[PDB]
């Protein structure tokens, strides 16, 4: 079944255009409720009521303020602007213990894959919990078409930790 | 009538990049290029003050193109004109037709080969209705210079008495009828300076048609019951064949 | 049993079966237990689609239903009737031979109209050739049918040439034929199914029954080398036979009534291949060119016989059955009388019961029989006579009621 | 995927040729209509005197005035579909009698009639090519037959007048 | 305007009659979404159904005409008013993705 | 259009009626081939039968008009559409041979 879709696809816009507060109209609403914006996640950027709801729920007063925000007919996003929800610690935030992370460089997926597919054998040295040095000596990256696949390969290789691509 | 119809069918003629010329003959230069949208607004002050609107009768757009044709035209940046496809058998729907024996089939084959020779010319003509250039075609003979080609194509279009499609920049109007073609030849330039006024043949559909434009394979199939006038067959002479000998007895 | 054209005939699936088929398909494609089915939007949809398809299938059922000479009843009856070269007889203008008497004998074109007893026009297409004497011309009624009139002087002098004097004609009418109804056509066709056969035992019957005035018919052949026998006949009903006749070998025989002698002779002379036996002597002539390029007229003389009409006697008893609901003899007589009888056909008790009942009949029949000489009934058939047509007059149809 | 289904599915626009539910549904409609198309196409196949059994044969009888009731007894064609009484015709015999009757309906008293259809041609393809008519002397009609027909059948046809016969007839053995 | 809803992958929906129908402002969304997808000389019952793809993705130099024809199809849709559309990537391999935004007849009630 | 075939040397053919007739696409070929060969003021029943040879091969400076008239004859033929013709040799002794190519109404069924 060779679909029409592989010569044209028509879908719905998914990410909120992923813009940044550059212009003057980058307005904020500061909450104090540690629901989803904890410290080090001090802000989130939105351009529609529904997204604020999905991160905040139409019940929480923050989504209510977003609703009364975007409901203004000439609202800021109509002139190159964004809404942003902040967070001031109202009372005794408890930051849950995290696990060590390692975020890699921004890789375009158009250059990482062509360079990987020639690399027959693998080679890593990683350490988790300061344990014995782990060396990975076989990663047949030849059969890889997207970063999700190399992510899975690294996940299978690095023992004691999980590998994700994002 | 409706204000909505305006934008809707204002964009109904979109100019392709290939830039059909006077119908495919782009081998001249457009010195000037005008269109004339006109309207008849009845004059006297309209009657009611509440609803007596809907009184701007539309008009046939004319398109005037004056240009020059030389022996050697070098076209700057325009894509090739490619022959349009013969999408006639798109819905062609056989296999319900009867089972009939060989040389009963082949008799039909001979009849088909026999009248295809007499219909296929006009069939191609209707397939290429808007654009006459690739119907008449590039002249192809090395004797005729380029002004030969422009004049004989223009005469073919003019005697053709069939509407053509004409492209002003930003619009490729679909049914222009050649109204006036004046080529002029000064005695100080070997080129030909020609002014051609076309007039759109706009015609809408009065009757209920569910299908806008079907294939040739179903165009007659979805046609509504057509009407012809009466006639007195008992008073015809041009075909007054006698009664077949197989009928007088019976 | 969905739309099976089998030995059993045509079995177009019933509407419920078609709906079940479509619903089963829709159910398998979309939803095993989920999609709704009736008195519901999708259900009404399914109903519309099944309505289209069942329209077509009932058309199939009707088309095969009209492949049957005993059920056709319509145009399809004639389409199946063209399968032999016969069609329904056309309505014929009634003829009327009258005496006109004009003072001059130049010419008479189409126009005339007479006998205002009825709002009628009886025109012609021919001149007058004799003086003021009573010279006869033939008029055709303006109404195609069994039109007729009696001798009345009520002529409407439409546009008379001179208008000499009244034209009262002698009383004799040719009825004219009303267009043949399908009901007659069914029996004529099924009986005359051998029409295109050109001079066989059935060809004579089929091509004589086309004659403008014929009413009842039979054909006979004696194919044996031995005389006084009958083997081939128009109806198989008499092949049963074993009853005397007086005919010769290698001989046909026509019994016919109502046809013009000219046309009957035309058909018999065109379609006979042997000896012919009969009293009336029909004739034919034919224009043939000699190889020297001359002209002459052969006369084909052939003998046919007109049936000796007769009577028939019926021994019938009726049992009326609701206390105080007596039979009506008159209705029974007028029904049992109206049975059309074919030429020399066996009248048997066995069919006459069906004609001895009327639409709402309170009486049963328990002792019925037939006889030829007003007496001496016999429990089964009795023979009419090979050249004898029969009727059942209201006079001799005797009915005996039994009270209850 | 026969011709009917394929040529009709082209009326599915290409948004819907590949979505499985839509294609299946369109195929469902096309299939239900396709059984009617097949029925119309096979009507000719399954109707004529050859490929006819049971009621249609009887129908043909009543269209050619020949009921399966010949009131005579013929031995059985012992070389299930249908059984009748003894004194009726098993199908195949009644088929080929109806063929003979169809012939004799369009008879003519000419053995090589150039204008109209002859006796010889129509009796010959009545028996599908196992009959041969030559005249006699006292208007006898001698009739040769292939040995693939029992005497019972032919003597019955002559004894029921189903063979083509203008005035006189006979057979030969 | 009603129209039968299509599920995620875009196949048809039967059952739940009068409820698998999209009401509005989303019926326009679905109808534009798959009016774009209607190749021109496909349907024998509408041979100018929508824009001609086999003759626009198979020829060099049609991006402007792709965009003009998409605007034509969208604008000539029962329920839309305006458009705001352009190209967002530049054939990231060779496939270009264009961004199309239109104002339905709804959300103009103030 | 039917027309009696001619054999190799171009004489007429009788016999095999309805079979010595050229069917099509070759009937056009034969008919153009010998329409070129029809001198103008020959036929008393068509004195402008085809192009005038006694007044074009007997006068200097007619090559352009020879070509234009050949294009006229060919194009005005029942069954042809276009032409593509020019001169291939240059009077190798003094006879010039021109190359004539035309698209019949056939081979345009795609």
* Three-state SS letters, A11-31: CCCCCCCCCCCCCCEEEEEEE
Phi (first) and psi of residue B9, to 5 degrees: -100, 10
Which residue, chain included where needed, has tokens 């006036």? B180
Which B residues, 191 through 250, put their C-beta within 8 Å of a C-beta on chain E?
A: 210-215, 217-218, 222
Where is B75: in which H helix or E strand?
A: none
**Ramachandran area for residue A57 (φ above 0: left; ψ -120 to 50: alpha; else beta):** left
Q: Which of residues 88-127 of B touch F (CB under 8 A)?
A: 113-114, 116-118, 120-121, 124
On the CB side of E45, CA atoms within 13 Å amount to 10
Question: D52, D46 in Cβ contact below 8 A?
Answer: yes
**Separation of alpha carbons C309 and C295, rounded Å:** 43
Q: What whole-number distance in Å separates Cα of residue A135 and Cα of residue A157?
A: 9
* C-alpha pair distances (Å), C33 with each of C30, C41, D148, E82: 9, 17, 61, 44
Exposure b/e, D30-63, CB count within 10 A at least 16 = b: bebbbbbbebeeeeeeebebeebbebbbbbbbbb
Q: Annotate D3-70 with DSSP letters as a single string.
A: HHHHHHHTTS-TTSSSSHHHHHHHHHHHHHHHHHHHHHHHHHHHHSSSS--THHHHHHHHHTT--S--
Technique employed here was: cryo-EM
* CB contact set of B62 (below 8 Å; sequence gap of 6+): B35, B36, B38, B179, B197, B198, B199, B200
Q: How far is CA C277 from CA B148, C231, C280, C306, in A?
A: 94, 15, 9, 11
CA angle D163, C383, C330 (to 5 degrees): 125
> Is the CB of residue D29 less than 8 Å from the CB of residue D8?
no
Triad B84, B89, B95: Cα angle to 5°: 170
Alpha carbons C321 and C341: distance in angstroms, whole number:
31
> Which residues of chain B neighbour D41 with C-beta distances below 8 Å?
96, 98-99
The SS3 assignment for B165 reads strand
Whole-number Å distance between alpha carbons of A136 and A117: 17
3-state helix, strand, coil in chain A (%, to 5): 25, 15, 60
Q: Which two tokens stand for residue E34?
A: 């798959």
For residue F4, count other CB atoms closer than 10 A to its CB: 13
The DSSP code for A141 is T
Show the tokens assigned to F69: 């008239």
The span from the CA of B187 to the CA of B50, in Å, is 63
Q: Which residues of C touch E16 (CB under 8 A)?
A: 35-36, 42
β-strand B164-168 against B62-69: which pairing, if any? unpaired
Interface contact E11-D10, CB threshold 8 A: no
E43 lies within 8 A of chain A by CB: no
The closest alpha carbon to A65, from A54, A53, A77, belongs to A53
Distance CA B44, CA B35 (A): 28
Torsion of CA C61, C65, C67, C68, to 10 degrees: 160
Q: Where are the alpha helices (DSSP H) in C287-357?
A: 329-336, 349-355
A124-126/C313-320 β-pairing: unpaired
Which residues of C, range 283-312, sit inside 8 Å of D by Cβ? none
Contacts of D150 (CB under 8 A, 6+ apart): D75
When scoring B17, B94, B172, B221 by the number of chain E Cβ atoms within 10 A, the one with the most, hence best to mutate, is B17
Cα(C387)–Cα(C389) distance, rounded to whole angstroms? 7
CA nearest neighbour of C283 among C302, C270, C267, C298: C302
Closest of B170, B182, B212, B160 to residue B64, by C-alpha: B182
How open is the CA angle B123-B125-B129, to the nearest 5 degrees? 120
* DSSP annotation of C69: T
The conformation of residue F83, written as its DSSP 8-state character, comes to E
Virtual CA dihedral for D68, D69, D74, D75, nearest 10 degrees?
Answer: 60
Bridge partners (DSSP) listed for residue B14: none
CA distance C271 to A109: 99
What count of other Cβ atoms lies within 10 Å of the Cβ of residue B31? Answer: 12
Chains in contact with A, where contact means 3 or more Cβ–Cβ distances below 8 Å, are D, E
Within 13 Å, how many C-alpha atoms sit on residue A69's CB side? 25
Q: Which helix (H) or strand (E) holds A2?
A: none
What's the CA gap between D103 and D165, in Å, rounded?
11
Indicate the angle between helix axes D91-105 and D119-126, nearest 10 degrees: 170
> Secondary structure of E16-54 in the HEC alphabet?
CCCCCEECCCCHHHHHHHHHCCCCCCCECCECCCCCCCC
Count other C-beta atoms under 10 Å from residue C289's C-beta.
9
The residue assigned the tokens 């109904």 is: B12
Spatial separation of the C-alpha atoms in residues F39 and D75, rounded to whole Å: 85
Contacts of A94 (CB under 8 A, 6+ apart): none
Q: Are C223 and D168 in contact (CB under 8 A)?
A: yes
Q: Are strands C216-222 and C251-257 parallel, antiparallel or unpaired?
A: antiparallel
E41, E44, E62 ranked by CB distance to B17: nearest: E62
Closest CA to D15 of E9, B37, A147: E9
D7 touches chain B (CB under 8 A): yes
> Using the 8-state DSSP alphabet, how is residue C178 labeled?
P
Helices (H), C227-290: 261-270
Q: Are F105 and F80 in contact (CB under 8 A)?
A: yes
Exposed e or buried b per residue across C337-366, where buried means at least 16 C-beta atoms within 10 angstroms of its C-beta:
bebebbbbbbbbbeebeeebeeeebebebe
Counted residue by residue, chain C has a size of: 404
Residue B20: its chain E contacts at CB < 8 A? none
What would the two tokens of residue A157 be?
Answer: 């290789």
Q: Say whether E108 sits in a helix, a strand or coil.
A: coil
Q: φ and ψ at A45, to 5 degrees?
A: -110, 135
Beta-bridge partners for B66 = B32, B195
CA neighbor of C318 nearest in space, from C350, C344, C356: C356
Chain C residue numbers touching E15 (CB-CB < 8 A) = 30-31, 34-36, 42
**Tokens, residue C145:** 């049918």
Quick check: E85 contacting B, CB < 8 Å? no
Helix (H, G, I), strand (E, B) or coil at A55: helix
b vs e for D110-136, b when ≥16 Cβ sit within 10 Å of the residue's Cβ?
Answer: beeeeeebbbbbbbbebbeeebebeee
Question: Rounded distance, CA D102 to CA D164, Å?
Answer: 10
Q: Which two tokens stand for residue F54?
A: 């006694």
What is the helix (H) or strand (E) element at residue F21, kind and residue range?
A: strand F21-22
Element (H, E) at F79: none
End-to-end CA distance of chain A: 31
Farthest-apart Cα atoms in chain C, separation: 99
List all residues 6 or more positions away from C298 whose beta carbon is below 8 Å from its beta carbon. Answer: C285, C286, C288
Contact E17 C34 (CB under 8 A): no
Structure tokens at D2: 């026969």
CA end-to-end span of chain E: 22
CA distances from B193 to B20, B68, B167, C299 (A): 19, 4, 18, 93
Helix (H, G, I), strand (E, B) or coil at E69: helix
Residues of D with CB under 8 A from a CB of A: 14-15, 18
What is the gyration radius of the CA atoms in chain A, in angstroms?
22
Return left, alpha or beta for A108; rule: phi > 0 is left, psi -120 to 50 is alpha, else beta.
alpha
- Side-chain-side CA neighbours of C235 within 13 Å: the count stands at 19
Do E106 and B42 form a contact (C-beta atoms < 8 A)?
A: no
Q: Indicate which of C36, C44, C46, C47 best probes the interface with E, i.e. most E CBs within 10 Å of its own CB.
A: C36
- Give the residue ranges of DSSP H helices in F19-105: 27-35, 63-75
Cα(F68)–Cα(C174) distance, integer angstroms: 83
Q: Which of C284, C206, C280, C219 is nearest to C252 (CA)?
A: C219
Tell me the angle at which helices D20-47 and C41-65 cross, rounded to the nearest 10 degrees.
10
Report how far residue E101's alpha carbon sits from residue E82's, in angstroms, rounded to the nearest whole number. Answer: 8
For tokens 């030389």, the residue is: B70
A5 DSSP assignment: G
């Amino acid at each position: 079944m060779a679909s029409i879709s592989e010569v044209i696809r028509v879908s719905l816009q998914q990410e909120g255009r992923a813009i940044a507060p550059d212009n003057m109209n980058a307005v904020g609403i500061i909450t104090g409720n540690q629901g989803v914006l904890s410290t080090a996640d001090r802000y989130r950027i939105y351009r529609t009521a529904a997204a604020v709801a999905s991160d905040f729920g139409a019940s929480s007063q923050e989504s209510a303020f977003a609703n009364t925000f975007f409901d203004t007919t000439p609202n800021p996003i109509s002139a190159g602007g964004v809404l942003v929800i902040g967070y001031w610690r109202s009372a005794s935030e408890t930051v849950a213990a995290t696990s060590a992370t390692l975020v890699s460089e921004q890789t375009s997926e158009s250059v990482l894959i062509p360079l990987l597919n020639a690399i027959n054998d693998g080679s890593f040295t990683i350490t988790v919990d300061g344990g014995t040095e782990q060396e990975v000596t076989a990663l047949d990256f030849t059969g890889v078409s997207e970063l999700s696949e190399v992510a899975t390969i690294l996940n299978s290789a690095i023992t004691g930790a999980t590998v994700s691509e994002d | 009538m409706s204000l909505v119809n305006g934008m809707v069918e204002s964009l109904n003629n979109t100019k392709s990049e290939t830039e059909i010329g006077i119908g495919g003959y782009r081998l001249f230069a457009r010195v000037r290029e005008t269109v004339n949208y006109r309207n008849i607004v009845p004059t006297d002050t309209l009657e009611d003050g509440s609803s007596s609107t809907d009184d701007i009768i539309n008009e046939p757009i004319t398109v005037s193109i004056e240009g020059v044709v030389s022996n050697l035209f070098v076209e700057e940046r325009q894509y090739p004109q490619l022959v349009s496809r013969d999408f006639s058998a798109v819905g062609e729907i056989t296999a319900l037709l009867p089972a009939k024996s060989q040389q009963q089939i082949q008799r039909i084959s001979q009849i088909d080969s026999q009248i295809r020779d007499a219909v296929l010319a006009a069939e191609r003509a209707e397939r290429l209705a808007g654009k006459p250039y690739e119907f008449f075609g590039n002249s192809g003979n090395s004797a005729k210079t380029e002004q030969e080609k422009f004049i004989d194509f223009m005469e073919a279009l003019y005697f053709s008495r069939r509407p053509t499609e004409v492209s002003v920049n930003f619009r490729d109007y679909k049914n222009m009828a050649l109204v006036s073609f004046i080529p002029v030849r000064d005695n100080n330039t070997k080129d030909t300076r020609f002014t051609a006024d076309f007039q759109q043949i706009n015609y809408s559909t009065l009757v209920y048609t569910p299908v806008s434009s079907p294939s040739k394979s179903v165009s007659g199939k979805v046609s509504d019951a057509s009407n012809k006038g009466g006639q007195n067959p008992e008073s015809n002479e041009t075909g007054e064949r006698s009664l077949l000998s197989s009928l007088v007895g019976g | 049993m969905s739309l099976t054209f089998n030995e059993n005939g045509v079995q177009t699936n019933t509407f419920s079966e078609l709906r079940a088929l479509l619903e089963a398909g829709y159910r398998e494609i979309y939803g095993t237990d989920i999609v709704t089915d009736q008195e519901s939007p999708d259900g009404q949809r399914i109903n519309l689609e099944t309505l289209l398809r069942f329209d077509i299938e009932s058309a199939f059922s009707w088309l095969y239903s009209n492949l049957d000479p005993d059920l056709n009843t319509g145009d399809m009856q004639q389409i199946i009737g063209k399968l032999s070269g016969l069609v329904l007889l056309p309505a014929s203008r009634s003829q009327w031979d009258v005496t006109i008497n004009m003072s001059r004998a130049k010419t008479l074109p189409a126009g005339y109209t007479i006998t205002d007893e009825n709002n009628q026009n009886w025109f012609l297409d021919s001149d007058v050739d004799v003086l003021i004497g009573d010279n006869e011309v033939t008029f055709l009624s303006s109404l195609w049918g069994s039109i007729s009139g009696i001798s009345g002087s009520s002529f409407t002098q439409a546009t008379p040439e001179i208008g000499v004097v009244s034209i009262s004609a002698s009383a004799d009418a040719i009825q004219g034929r009303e267009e043949e109804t399908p009901e007659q056509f069914r029996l004529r066709r099924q009986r005359s199914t051998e029409n295109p056969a050109q001079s066989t035992i059935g060809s004579i019957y089929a091509k004589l029954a086309q004659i403008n005035g014929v009413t009842d018919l039979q054909v006979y052949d004696n194919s044996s080398d031995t005389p006084d026998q009958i083997t081939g006949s128009s109806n198989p009903d008499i092949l049963n036979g074993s009853e005397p006749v007086t005919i010769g070998a290698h001989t046909m025989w026509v019994v016919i009534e109502g046809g013009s002698l000219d046309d009957i002779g035309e058909v018999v002379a065109k379609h006979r291949l042997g000896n012919t036996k009969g009293s009336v002597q029909v004739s034919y002539i034919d224009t043939l060119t000699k190889p020297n390029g001359d002209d002459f007229q052969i006369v084909n003389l052939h003998n046919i016989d007109r049936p000796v009409l007769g009577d028939l006697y019926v021994r019938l008893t009726a049992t009326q059955k609701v206390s105080g609901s007596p039979i009506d003899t008159d209705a029974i007589k007028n029904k049992l009388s109206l049975v059309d009888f074919e030429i020399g056909q066996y009248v048997d008790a066995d069919a006459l019961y069906q004609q001895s009942l009327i639409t709402n009949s309170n009486y049963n029949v328990t002792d019925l029989e037939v006889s030829l000489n007003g007496i001496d009934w016999t429990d089964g058939r009795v023979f009419s006579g090979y050249d004898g047509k029969l009727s059942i007059s209201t006079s001799n149809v005797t009915i005996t009621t039994v009270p209850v | 995927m026969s011709d009917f289904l394929n040529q009709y599915l082209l009326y599915l626009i290409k948004q819907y040729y590949e979505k499985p539910k839509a294609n299946a549904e369109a195929q469902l409609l096309i299939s239900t209509w396709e059984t009617y198309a097949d029925f119309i196409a096979n009507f000719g196949n399954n109707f004529d005197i050859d490929n006819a059994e049971g009621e249609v044969l009887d129908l043909i009888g009543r269209i050619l005035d020949l009921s399966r009731q010949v009131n005579d007894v013929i031995p059985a064609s012992f070389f299930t579909s249908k059984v009748y009484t003894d004194y009726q015709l098993t199908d195949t015999q009644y088929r080929k009698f109806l063929k003979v009757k169809a012939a004799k309906n369009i008879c003519s008293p000419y053995l090589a009639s150039d204008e109209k259809i002859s006796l010889q041609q129509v009796v010959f393809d009545a028996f599908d090519g196992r009959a041969y008519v030559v005249d006699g002397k006292d208007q006898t009609l001698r009739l040769y037959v292939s040995p693939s027909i029992d005497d019972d059948e032919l003597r019955l046809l002559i004894n029921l007048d189903i063979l083509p016969r203008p005035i006189t007839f006979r057979y030969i053995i | 305007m009603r129209v039968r809803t299509l599920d995620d992958n875009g196949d048809w929906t039967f059952g739940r009659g009068k409820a698998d129908y999209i009401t509005s402002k989303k019926a326009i969304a679905q109808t534009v979404s798959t009016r774009i997808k209607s190749w021109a000389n496909d349907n024998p019952l509408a041979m100018n159904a929508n824009i001609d793809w086999k003759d626009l993705l198979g020829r060099k130099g049609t991006e402007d005409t792709i965009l003009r024809e998409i605007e034509r199809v969208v604008v000539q849709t029962d329920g839309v008013i305006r458009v705001t559309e352009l190209e967002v990537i530049k054939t990231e391999k060779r496939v270009q993705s264009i961004l199309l935004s239109y104002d339905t007849i709804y959300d103009d009630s103030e």
